[PDB]
Symmetry: C2
Subunit: 306 residues, 2 copies
């Protein structure tokens, strides 16, 4: 009973956060096995940020210029290299707390947990979605860069995100763990264009199902509609178009609630056209889009991790 | 930049969760030093829940009737006793992962993180508030009982909550770590009256300050008001009355934003009387009350834990 924006437990990631300091800049790194991953702009000063030549800057740096520390443990850099926008600092000590992990590149609309850190120390954890314009609406202050996003599948941590920049519009941009940015962004302090932030329609539908499961049913009508008629209305309100893949992914929720996907679409369309009236759904006056169908199944079933 | 409902990192609590099984009932326990804390209704069947005599039920149980396991580690109960509504299971092995901790009883309006568990394994973490009617709006399924709420102060885990019941209205009730319920609730499956759920006014004000800090300023007027005139309007909308202690606690936020507390009160009153109009504040169409003034200072400053 009840529904909450739930994060994954962060214990297996807390033990991988380190502090990386090169010159005067200090940010967070991810220590897995005997390598530390961090944003390459750790080698920049605040002045170099407006037009850095990362090749030129990196070459006037040696192994002993990078100070990595895990708590009061001082690590020794014995090799460094640049992979896209992340710096891989090869150290001598493998992390004894390295969990089973993999690097994954997620798609827009997927959700993950962010462990926000400062100077290598965890501060808080929250759940968010990759927006369709490849930004995230996070909570980051100066020095939070290198904080990572993750999922916990089975007993394995799936690292999917590392924070690099705050854009002038206040939103956040970052890379995967191979150093490739999500979206068209670059690690350069300049005016960068983010596109239209649309609503993740399939996620809204998963949340409506979660509401029905929890007893919030006032929005249900017996109206129906088709994919095309729904998408016409969705496109008018800056909603992502629904495809047949999305209908399939809502299948298990349709089965457990007895409500057809296209019937739920017809309820959503009326909410788009006529509004919430001032009612709420699961304690919210807005349509929520940061739960995937899997998050809903996870939470309404009681899936645990180890 | 940005604002999120942030939970504390859960690593130091994950290593204290165990599974407790007595007879056919299995729920979660909290393993600190050489004692396991769990809800005493672990000794009930589903049938005994409507009128249990915990004294009578407990006396037909011995040490070897309680099976406590931490992962694939089997613990041995060498002593048991009932303290109010929690069972203290004395075991032979002290937890090697016992953090610095204390037990605290929080007051309504305070916030904490809940680690939702099933069968001793963590499932997710979220942040919530103790409502003024001593319930919490959580996310709990069957078998989540014994899940605990906590804060992280400095390097010390402050345990403040343990989940015991879901009420027929769908909300959740629990105890402190001494076994005393929050509110007038009892560990008995019966119709129980929860009072009026009012809005935590001081928390709303702290969140308005957070909005101004983050650039959301459209609700600011130069109107002013007094405590009494504000409380007259607040009481009409089921808002908790603001006292001078609350004004003092908003002091640091007033200083950093240059906006007087009574001025912020005048803005809030207009929002109560005229509504949101359809605008939003920090991405929300409703007035948010699950951030304390301390949460706001914490998040907008970058406080880290160890």
């Amino acid at each position: 009973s009840g529904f909450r924006k739930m994060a994954f437990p962060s214990g297996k990631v807390e033990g991988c956060m380190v502090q990386v300091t090169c010159g005067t800049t200090t940010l967070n790194g991810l220590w897995l096995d005997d390598v530390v991953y961090c944003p390459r702009h750790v080698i920049c000063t605040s002045e170099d940020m407006f037009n850095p030549n990362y090749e030129d800057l990196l070459i006037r740096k040696s192994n002993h210029n990078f100070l990595v520390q895990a708590g009061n443990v001082q690590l020794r850099v014995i090799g460094h290299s640049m992979q896209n926008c992340v710096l891989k600092l090869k150290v001598d000590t493998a992390n004894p707390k390295t969990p089973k992990y993999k690097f994954v590149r997620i798609q827009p609309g997927q959700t993950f947990s962010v462990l926000a850190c400062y100077n290598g120390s965890p501060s808080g954890v929250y759940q968010c979605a990759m927006r369709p314009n490849f930004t995230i609406k996070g909570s980051f202050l100066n020095g939070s860069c290198g904080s990572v996003g993750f999922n916990i599948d089975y007993d394995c941590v799936s690292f999917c995100y590392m924070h690099h920049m705050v854009l002038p519009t206040g939103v956040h941009a970052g890379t995967d763990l191979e150093g490739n940015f999500y979206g068209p962004f670059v690690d350069r302090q300049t005016a960068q264009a983010a596109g239209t932030d649309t609503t993740i329609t399939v996620n809204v539908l998963a949340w409506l199902y979660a509401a029905v499961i929890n007893g919030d049913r006032w929005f249900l009508n017996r109206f129906t509609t088709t994919l095309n008629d729904f998408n016409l209305v969705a496109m008018k309100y800056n909603y992502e178009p629904l495809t047949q893949d999305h209908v399939d992914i809502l299948g298990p929720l349709s089965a457990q609630t007895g409500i057809a996907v296209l019937d739920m679409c017809a309820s959503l369309k009326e909410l788009l056209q006529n509004g919430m009236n001032g009612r709420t759904i699961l304690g919210s006056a807005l349509l929520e889009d940061e739960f995937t169908p899997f998050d809903v199944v996870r939470q309404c079933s009681g899936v645990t991790f180890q």
